[PDB]
Design a protein around this nucleic acid. Structure first.
Lengths: 97, 80, 230, 93, 75, 23, 98, 274, 96, 108, 79, 97
DNA sequence: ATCAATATCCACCTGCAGATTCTACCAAAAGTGTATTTGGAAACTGCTCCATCAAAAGGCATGTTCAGCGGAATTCCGCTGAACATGCCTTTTGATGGAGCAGTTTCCAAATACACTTTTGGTAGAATCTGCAGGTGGATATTGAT
DNA sequence: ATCAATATCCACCTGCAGATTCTACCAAAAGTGTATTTGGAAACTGCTCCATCAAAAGGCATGTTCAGCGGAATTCCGCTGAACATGCCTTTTGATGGAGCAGTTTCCAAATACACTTTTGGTAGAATCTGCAGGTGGATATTGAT
């Protein structure tokens, strides 16, 4: 079979998805996840689905901030892969508390 | 009340890094990005549910989650 | 004043300046054990079968009343397996024998069934033994203990003694209304004491019968050796 | 019963090139825009009127506040036009 | 009621069985060399042939309730 | 005079070996 | 004629007066300050609308979708300092390739 | 009580009253079966088992055999009569367990000991067939026929490394019964020095839910009944205080038998219904 | 010549903790700024909360939930429990 | 002991009316609660007591009985409960805490 | 007039050992003065706003302490 | 004319300095600087000396945050010698614009 | 490995501010009793929405394959930097002249509260419009192996 | 330098999915006149808190001068990226069961506004002990040369 360079196809997905603004996290994994994180601490609180999309965008905006600054962190780290102590450094660096 | 660890989902990072502008991933970050994800959501849900019990309200609004993100630090736009 | 949080520290030195005897005639045996660990997947009601063992009282009309000269043989450890047979043999099909004391069902309508009847697949060797040809002596299990090579079977003594056994079932099971001489439990109430079959599970049943078969053959390794022993 | 300036921002859109449409969830996103810029200036108004040690809701500290929160040259000429607006309000005498 | 429940408990009383099976062919198939140098004087024809009979018996108890459900579920 | 089923059983087990747990 | 008509602005004067009423604390207020406080939001919001029109000459896309709404709201670079707390729903990110 | 307990080598009164003599408040001796523990009340109903027995221990299948004892799980949803006889064994002393349902589901962690003539039982501890608390031990009972050495201890040396292959949290329940604390918080205290003589870097006291597999705030209580929690000098300091200087060396010099965690063949079980 | 101050009260609570614990005027102004700044920030947050609930009587319920919110639950639990203590000794509508 | 109360009832350590016009000087809306706004006393008496005992902690630490600013923060930015609650609150000239990174020292 | 360097290499290495750093670039100087003047101009600009609404040609500490209260580096002690 | 291993007095500097807490800068250079950069918004502006010291420790907190930041950034980069773009990404990644 | 060489830890004298500690005046209340809107718990009260369940492809997902530059590092060469050393700028702590703010008085746009009279923006109704987002056919970028 | 199968640009074609855009309605905050007040404007003035300079000491500039560390080239090798078979769970799109809502009337302690009143906190400040930072001394934590 035909195989491209691993990475310029990734540049196509980069252009695809920087170009994109689609809905990232699938609904039902996310919503039974927010169900199961809800029921525990007190009586099983009802939801609204637009707020589930608010949670969608919340966690995804949180991580695209984290992914852009870990991007610059890794690429100045003269590696280009991503690992644990960069995200530890980035949570320090964004000031978690 | 079927709960277990279904947080183990997906390298959705393999899309979020395409929404990201980063080169190669080589995975293995998954449990701790789920940890920081779960920290983020537990921080926002304690805020939200303190608010919805402040309303004596069982459901959550979107004004709740707007105001919750506002007090923790980011401004959601357009959902009240 | 607080219960702490994680991550913290520590420092090593510095200045914050009637012995029993009756395992002889009751208990016996010796047990081996290797690095291999001994396997089980059965219940114990299989292992003892008869869920009954009994007293001097119901055998003093049996042993030391008669058994010098039993015209057909009436031993102690034969009374058990015969008296264990019939009450189960009216159990899986008659439940209403219990609540009404005027009406336990009698053997005069139990003759043509219980000669051929089954205490839950009782001769279950034979549908494997009819091919394994081990009938030159009798069949013995590992849950057969060592008490029974020297005993007799059942279905032939009903020609001999079979209508003198249930006659003493009747007159002590009812003074508590329906309990065996060792009664069951706090058994009655938990209060206090005192579309799938189209491609996958077509394969439900074969994957044991293809293993119910060659186990005979890997045991035909030794089952052919029983003339090498001769 | 509720509130927005949707036709009013449409009036702005026809003050410029009128011909466009707007996606109708970005309308909520721009109501979020006008809402949070308004509460931002409202809270900053309340606090600066608090700690300038006065009690009439006043003018020139609101002026300085909406300067100081805001990026520069747009703050400067935007408040210049705002002063033009209050003078053309009041100067209708 | 459904063949999956009687599939699965015949995977769950089979929670011993392929582990039995991968145990079973060894402890005898180990000592099948003893007779090549037996070329003691009462027992091992009888007692060492016991566990093979309950290598033959141990599978046999699985059948008095299941095997009827092959036909009663396809009706 | 005693091997009449001893004589064949000792390879066929490898066939059943290659029958159901060899896929 | 009216309140807004003397200032000649588009926003209704009494509503922002009311919207400076119910948030407030201090019970007394030079109302003429509303007539510029009405415009305190205005030119900043009239800024951001027409600077959402860059492709709009050469795309013939008549509606402004929320990535397109972001895709030159980020080009409000100076007001990204104002948008430093911002998160836009379905806005996206601009390609920043290092 | 009723009809004082006779088995083994020791003579016992049954501490709790009568769950088993619902029908049997009419005989005099109580004699005990061991391997499947099915007793008989009047005399001759019991002693016909010597000729009957082929099973010579509780029929567990082993991840365990030391030189000395044996350890068993029994699948309790599997077992029916013998899943309630050992409850009925337990009740005549230990009434502490919850009997709203004549409990079928819950799981068994039972102990008996190697001998040639017979596996002479000691008693056991249990586990519910749910999992919400953590469930490190549910219901200890040792019988006083076999009571005196560290075998009564060795129940709590067993539970945590079940969570070394299951590797989740274990948690005691609200039936906090007394005398096991002279084992429990004794042995759960000095697990700290097993981790304290190592990791001379900073002690991140969540990781004992991964190292001891134990919850910290409870294990700090046995550490703060040890009072091992100083602070505010610039840190929290666990502080080797020099009373420990014998007592770890007491367990450096007078050690006893162990196990080894290689010797396990068991997958952590997850069950079916909901 | 006119300033709201706190200092005697915190000094009284400091001496009733320990009769010998001295402090500075610098640290006085520091924890002064601490206490009133945290008072204004819980004031702002509670005020916003009771506002947006669409309710007009500003309660202990709103700031009670707000101190569960703005304050971490160990010393927030401490505060709420001492609040229960306090309101039980607000409860006696009595002479004693 | 006496029938006249200074609002003398709360186990109280603060003047109530001063903090009531501290409520009445945030004064956005119109209606508050009256006695149940004096839970601000138990609000205020929580955290000052949370620090003064901790500030009692570093007294005999340095055997030093008058207590000064730069070890208020040196416990505070140490104090995990109360660094984070007031991180952005910054102190006059107390500096920060002496920390040496562990990957820096190579015994050289 | 130009006195940005008076906060100097020994001064900045003392406050660098306040941060602790050791392998000092000696090309750090113009940009550490640059981020210096950046930060101070960012805080003095709104200090100027908070004194200029006060109609007061001196700068107190309360105006500037609001000027750093609002932006995100609030500081204590001077009121 | 004797000296130990070259450099290890920097750890002594850590000890004497981070154990300490005091002010650093000569006050009047900072004063002349801030009057010079107060001229370019309004003429004749005076200043509180206490506010001057507040400015001092504020920019001090800013820089010490930057120093510890860039320190562990460089040490994530398996190296310690910090440079321009290190504090540039530390600036962008702490976030002043 | 064994003393010199610093340079630190602890501890005993010493001159302050100087907290602080109590007195002291009195200002301004807190706390008080009581009249009153009034905001408020809540009971009612229909229901939107929140969930269980059907049921069947479809787009992904999680396999194992396997081939590969990204990274981890160590190498010999190279160096702007750090560490005791000599001369110097100024800053620091000594020293004196003005505005301004902070307060104290008065004078009126201007606001609240009421009491009126409108438009117009809220819901919402749906006809017509068309935008555009999606699908399809020719011409044009785009890279791996040779 | 060149072959050549993949993927995208751009014009043409359409379903429908809301949008908009009024017409209606309605009901309702808003604009505006009138009275009281009232808070700020602001003008005068007093003496803080800014303004400015003269002697030492001390940081500091400037050395000089070698080095642990940088540091790319080069090295191995890895866990993953592309790709491909196949389970196989979301995601519907209805279908439905039931409830903790979001209201609107609902009567009612009770905050909340009025003014007495007796402590008492704010400042204002003096006594005066003393806590303690630092000078001095003794003994030694950490570490070089050969």
């Amino acid at each position: 079979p035909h195989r491209y360079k691993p990475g310029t196809v990734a540049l196509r997905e980069i252009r695809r998805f920087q170009k994109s603004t689609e809905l990232l996290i699938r609904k039902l994994p996310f919503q039974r996840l927010v169900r199961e994180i809800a029921q525990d601490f007190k009586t099983d609180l009802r939801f609204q689905s637009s707020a589930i999309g608010a949670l969608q965008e919340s966690v995804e905006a949180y991580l695209v901030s984290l992914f852009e600054d870990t991007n610059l962190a890794a690429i100045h780290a003269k590696r280009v892969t991503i690992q644990k102590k960069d995200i530890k450094l980035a949570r320090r660096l964004r000031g978690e508390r | 009340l079927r709960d277990n660890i279904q947080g183990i989902t997906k390298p959705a990072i393999r899309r979020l890094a395409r929404r990201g502008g980063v080169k190669r991933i080589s995975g293995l970050i998954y449990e701790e990005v789920r940890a920081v994800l779960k920290s983020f959501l537990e921080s926002v849900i304690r805020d939200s549910v303190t608010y919805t019990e402040h309303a004596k309200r069982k459901t959550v609004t979107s004004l709740d989650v707007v105001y919750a993100l506002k007090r923790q630090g980011r401004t959601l736009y357009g959902f009240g | 004043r607080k219960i702490s949080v994680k991550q913290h520290l520590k420092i090593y030195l510095p200045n914050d300046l009637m012995t029993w005897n009756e395992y002889d005639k009751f208990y016996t045996g010796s047990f081996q054990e290797t690095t291999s660990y001994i396997k089980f997947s059965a219940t114990v009601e299989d292992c003892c079968g008869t869920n009954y063992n009994m007293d001097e009282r119901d055998e003093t009309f049996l042993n030391e009343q008669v058994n010098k000269g039993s015209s057909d043989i009436l031993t102690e450890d034969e009374f058990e397996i015969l008296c264990s047979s019939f009450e189960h043999a009216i159990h899986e099909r008659q439940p209403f024998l219990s609540m009404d004391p005027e009406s336990i069902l009698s053997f005069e309508e139990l003759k043509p069934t219980l000669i051929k009847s089954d205490m839950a697949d009782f001769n279950l060797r034979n549908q494997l033994n009819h091919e394994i040809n081990s009938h030159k002596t009798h069949f013995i299990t590992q849950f057969d203990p060592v008490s029974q090579m020297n005993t007799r079977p059942l279905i032939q003594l009903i020609e001999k003694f079979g209508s003198k056994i249930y006659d003493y079932w009747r007159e002590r099971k009812i003074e508590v209304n329906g309990y065996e001489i060792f009664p069951q439990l706090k058994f009655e109430r938990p209060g206090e004491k005192e579309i799938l079959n189209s491609q996958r599970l077509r394969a439900l049943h074969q994957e044991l019968k293809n293993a119910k078969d060659l186990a005979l053959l890997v045991a035909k390794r030794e089952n052919v050796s029983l003339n090498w022993i001769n | 019963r509720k509130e927005t300036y949707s036709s009013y921002i449409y009036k702005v859109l026809k003050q410029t090139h009128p011909d466009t449409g707007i996606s109708q969830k970005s309308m909520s996103i721009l109501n979020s825009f006008v809402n949070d810029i308004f509460e931002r200036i409202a809270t900053e108004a309340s606090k600066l009127a608090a700690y300038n040690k006065k009690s009439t809701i006043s003018a020139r500290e609101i002026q300085t506040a909406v300067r100081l929160i805001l990026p520069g040259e747009l703050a400067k000429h935007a408040v210049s036009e705002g002063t033009r607006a209050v003078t053309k309000y009041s100067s209708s005498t | 009621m459904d063949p999956s429940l009687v599939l699965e408990q015949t995977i769950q009383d089979v929670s011993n069985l392929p582990s039995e099976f991968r145990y079973l062919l060894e402890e005898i198939g180990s000592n099948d060399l003893k007779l090549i140098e037996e070329k003691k004087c009462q027992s091992l024809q009888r007692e060492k042939c016991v566990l093979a009979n309950t290598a033959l018996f141990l599978i046999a108890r699985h059948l008095n309730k299941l095997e009827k459900n092959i036909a009663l579920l396809e009706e | 005079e005693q091997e009449d089923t001893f004589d064949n059983l000792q390879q066929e087990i490898y066939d059943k070996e290659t029958e159901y747990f060899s896929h | 004629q009216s309140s807004s008509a003397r200032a000649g602005l588009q926003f209704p004067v009494g509503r922002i007066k009311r919207y400076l009423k119910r948030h407030a604390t201090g019970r007394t207020r030079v109302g003429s300050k509303a007539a510029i406080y009405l415009t305190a939001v205005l030119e900043y919001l009239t800024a951001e609308v027409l600077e959402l029109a860059g492709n709009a000459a050469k795309d013939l896309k008549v509606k402004r979708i929320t990535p397109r709404h972001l895709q030159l709201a980020i080009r409000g670079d100076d007001e990204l300092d104002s948008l430093i707390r911002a998160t836009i729903a379905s806005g996206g990110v601009l390609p920043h390739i290092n | 009580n009723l009809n004082r307990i006779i088995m083994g080598k020791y003579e016992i009164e049954p501490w709790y009253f009568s769950p088993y003599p619902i029908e049997l408040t009419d005989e005099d001796f109580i004699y005990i079966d061991d391997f499947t523990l099915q007793y008989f009340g009047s005399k001759k109903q019991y002693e016909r088992y010597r000729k009957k027995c082929t099973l010579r221990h509780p029929p567990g299948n082993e991840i365990y055999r030391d030189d000395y004892v044996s350890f068993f799980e029994i699948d309790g949803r599997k077992q029916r009569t013998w899943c309630r006889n050992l409850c009925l064994l337990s009740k005549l002393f230990l009434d502490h367990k919850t009997l709203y349902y004549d409990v079928d589901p819950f799981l068994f962690y039972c102990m008996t000991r190697r001998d040639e003539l017979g596996h002479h039982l000691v008693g056991y501890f249990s586990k519910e067939k749910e999992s919400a608390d953590g469930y490190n031990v549910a219901c200890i009972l040792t019988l006083p026929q076999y009571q005196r050495m560290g075998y009564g201890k060795l129940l709590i040396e067993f539970s945590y490394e079940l969570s070394k292959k299951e590797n989740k949290v274990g948690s005691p329940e609200k039936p906090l019964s007394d005398l096991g604390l002279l084992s429990y918080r004794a042995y759960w205290s000095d697990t700290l020095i097993t981790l304290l003589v190592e990791h001379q870097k900073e002690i991140t006291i969540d990781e004992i839910s991964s190292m001891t597999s134990m919850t910290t705030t409870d294990i700090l209580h046995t550490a703060k009944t040890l009072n091992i929690l100083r602070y505010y000098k610039g840190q929290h300091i666990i502080f080797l205080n020099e009373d420990i200087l014998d007592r770890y060396n007491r367990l450096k010099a007078k050690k006893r038998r162990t196990i080894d965690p290689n010797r396990l063949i068991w997958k952590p079980p997850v069950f079916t219904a909901s």
